[PDB]
Amino acid sequence: MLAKLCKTIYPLADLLARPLPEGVDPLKLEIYLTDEDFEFALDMTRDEYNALPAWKQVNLKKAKGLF
């Protein structure tokens, strides 16, 4: 808990046009989707986009429909 962090991804559906929760931030979706959801909806990973540009990374989201 204090030594290791713990994150949880929200159902891609919710963020991909479905009654999403609050943990899911509309301005930052790619941040709440695991490599699976990331690779399926963005074809990238939190560790890939984490370094890539903020617009280019977004470029894909809008292209797939995430953001």
In order of their start, the domains of the chain are 1-67 (1.10.950.10)
Residue with tokens 């894909």: 60
Structure tokens at 37: 């959801």
Measured from the Cβ of residue 11, the count of other Cβ atoms closer than 10 Å reads: 14
Query: Residue 23 in contact with residue 8, Cβ under 8 Å?
Result: yes
Residues in the chain: 67
Cα 60 to chain centroid, rounded: 11
Query: Residue 29 in contact with residue 15, Cβ under 8 Å?
Result: yes
Structure solved via: NMR
